[PDB]
Amino acid sequence: MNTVPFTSAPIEVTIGIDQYSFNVKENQPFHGIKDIPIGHVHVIHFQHADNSSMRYGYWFDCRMGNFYIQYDPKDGLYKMMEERDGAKFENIVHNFKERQMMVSYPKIDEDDTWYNLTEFVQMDKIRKIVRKDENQFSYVDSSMTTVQENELSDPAHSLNYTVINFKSREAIRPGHEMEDFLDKSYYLNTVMLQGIFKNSSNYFGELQFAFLNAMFFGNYGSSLQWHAMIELICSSATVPKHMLDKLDEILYYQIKTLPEQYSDILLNERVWNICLYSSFQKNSLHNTEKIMENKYPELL
Amino acid sequence: GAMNSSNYAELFNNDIKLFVDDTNVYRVTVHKTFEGNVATKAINGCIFTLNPKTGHLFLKIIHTSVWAGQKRLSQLAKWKTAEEVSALVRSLPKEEQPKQIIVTRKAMLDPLEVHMLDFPNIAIRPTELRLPFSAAMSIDKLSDVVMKATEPQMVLFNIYDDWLDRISSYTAFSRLTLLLRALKTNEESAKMILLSDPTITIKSYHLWPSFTDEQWITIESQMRDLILTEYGRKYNV
Numbered sequence: 001m002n003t004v005p006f007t008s009a010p011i012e013v014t015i016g017i018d019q020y021s022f023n024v025k026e027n028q029p030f031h032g033i034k035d036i037p038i039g040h041v042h043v044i045h046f047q048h049a050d051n052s053s054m055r056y057g058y059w060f061d062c063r064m065g066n067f068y069i070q071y072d073p074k075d076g077l078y079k080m081m082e083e084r085d086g087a088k089f090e091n092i093v094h095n096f097k098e099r100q101m102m103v104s105y106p107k108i109d110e111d112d113t114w115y116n117l118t119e120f121v122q123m124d125k126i127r128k129i130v131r132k133d134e135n136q137f138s139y140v141d142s143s144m145t146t147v148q149e150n151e152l153s154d155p156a157h158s159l160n161y162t163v164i165n166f167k168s169r170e171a172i173r174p175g176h177e178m179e180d181f182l183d184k185s186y187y188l189n190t191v192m193l194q195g196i197f198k199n200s201s202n203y204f205g206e207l208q209f210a211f212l213n214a215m216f217f218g219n220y221g222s223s224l225q226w227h228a229m230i231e232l233i234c235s236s237a238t239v240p241k242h243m244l245d246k247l248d249e250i251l252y253y254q255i256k257t258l259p260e261q262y263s264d265i266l267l268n269e270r271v272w273n274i275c276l277y278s279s280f281q282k283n284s285l286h287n288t289e290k291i292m293e294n295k296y297p298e299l300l
Numbered sequence: 301g302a303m304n305s306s307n308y309a310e311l312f313n314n315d316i317k318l319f320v321d322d323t324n325v326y327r328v329t330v331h332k333t334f335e336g337n338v339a340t341k342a343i344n345g346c347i348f349t350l351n352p353k354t355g356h357l358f359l360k361i362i363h364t365s366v367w368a369g370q371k372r373l374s375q376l377a378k379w380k381t382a383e384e385v386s387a388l389v390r391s392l393p394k395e396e397q398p399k400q401i402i403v404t405r406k407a408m409l410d411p412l413e414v415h416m417l418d419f420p421n422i423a424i425r426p427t428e429l430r431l432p433f434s435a436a437m438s439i440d441k442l443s444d445v446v447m448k449a450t451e452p453q454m455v456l457f458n459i460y461d462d463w464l465d466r467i468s469s470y471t472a473f474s475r476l477t478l479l480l481r482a483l484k485t486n487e488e489s490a491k492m493i494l495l496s497d498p499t500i501t502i503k504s505y506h507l508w509p510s511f512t513d514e515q516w517i518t519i520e521s522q523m524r525d526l527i528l529t530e531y532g533r534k535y536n537v
């Protein structure tokens with residue numbers, strides 16, 4: 001179990017850690033989060049009490065280094081940093097566990113939710129979508145735009161998701177126009193899976209990361225990316241059977257975890273009605289269709 | 301974006317544009333089978349591709365053999381249309397290619413856009429106008445070349461005959477759409493109007509009769525009466 005300590009909490013803020021969250025009052029004696037499960041990526045995220053504008057946060061993996069949070073009063077935000085000095089970090093953290101100044105990552109033992117939302121997400125791939133190579137952790141906020149959004153404006157601060165575009169020369173083989181537009185298997189299997197992602201695990205990893213950025217930061221371009229990656233699979237007549245079964249599980253846990261009150265903005269009615277009821281895979285997502293129908297029957 | 305009554309004069313500016321109408325590409329007769337079921341039999345069709353400024357009509361005849369062994373023909377017909385328009389554009393010299401293609405039915409947008417990915421600078425546009433180009437098969441000489449074709453064929457016409465010698469393209473298009481609207485609302489009456497007087501003939505190299513300016517005013521008035529009338533006989537007013 002690992003720890004993300006804090007120098008202080010000088011401003012009132014709601015802090016999230018994965019799917020959990022808690023309020024910290026201005027100058028409350030808070031010095032971080034302990035008992036963070038090893039083996040998963042994590043996200044620690046922030047919403048200031050005085051400006052709900054800009055949710056922001058940091059993706060990290062405690063196996064990759066010792067990370068802590070310090071408020072920067074010049075830039076006005078909680079920043080993640082790395083301490084090179086291990087012995088000092090252990091010594092400073094222990095002092096805090098002894099004074100009980102940390103909240104405990106509150107994982108129920110039955111609960112596989114975080115695993116199920118991050119199964120294919122790896123820090124190395126996050127760091128290629130979020131380019132800032134001098135840090136081992138990655139910053140994301142509500143306003144960051146994606147590479148594709150910028151094509152339709154700061155490149156260093158972009159989300160470099162894989163561009164998917166159904167009316168593009170990449171998607172459509174000369175002479176197979178109708179075939180490739182109405183059945184996207186070529187684009188899914190040859191162009192994206194074999195060509196760009198190499199395997200379905202990397203595809204699912206980006207899909208899961210896009211969903212989590214949409215949910216936790218309200219990042220609109222991430223939501224677009226999540227839906228496009230769903231739609232590319234559902235609009236393919238030919239999909240490996242293991243991929244469909246895994247997609248059903250992935251989406252099930254995403255829909256299960258989604259705040260009931262964010263469904264209106266985070267779920268695209270056209271994509272979901274198409275995927276569940278018209279697409280080639282309309283009958284291949286049993287778990288996802290059942291939870292969608294019982295939780296969000298309005299959308300459909 | 302969409303073409304409507306507000307940007308109507310744009311059709312007659314000097315940017316090359318084509319209208320594409322697909323309503324006569326896939327044509328069938330519905331009939332009973334010996335067993336008492338219903339079946340369709342396809343008949344030859346055509347793509348109606350028209351330069352509204354010059355009157356040049358690229359009539360691609362769609363022979364029934366193109367449907368043999370195919371499924372979902374109404375959907376295929378939109379993609380076949382788009383493939384043929386794309387092939388037409390590619391066959392034209394660069395300086396003759398259109399800058400805009402306006403489709404008369406919105407279901408042509410994605411098929412045409414996908415077939416024209418190679419031409420990012422050609423705008424594919426819908427229209428809010430209800431244009432009567434379906435009635436093109438009521439022009440006898442066009443109907444005749446379509447129904448006689450034994451193979452795929454492209455035939456080139458000027459749908460304005462020699463009118464541009466005397467009138468502008470705005471006026472020629474207005475005349476064309478009035479004639480076609482009339483033929484679409486009451487084909488028998490419209491055709492009676494156009495040919496009643498045996499002394500006015502259609503030149504071999506034309507589609508419509510050789511009306512004088514004065515006779516066109518008479519003709520045009522008789523077509524508006526027809527359209528208003530039928531609108532009476534239809535709605536009872």
Ligand SMILES: COc1ccccc1C(N)=O
Nearest residue numbers: 005006068083088089092
């Ligand atoms: C020792 O790591 C640090 C370095 C500077 C400031 C604070 C910390 C910490 N762990 O809280």
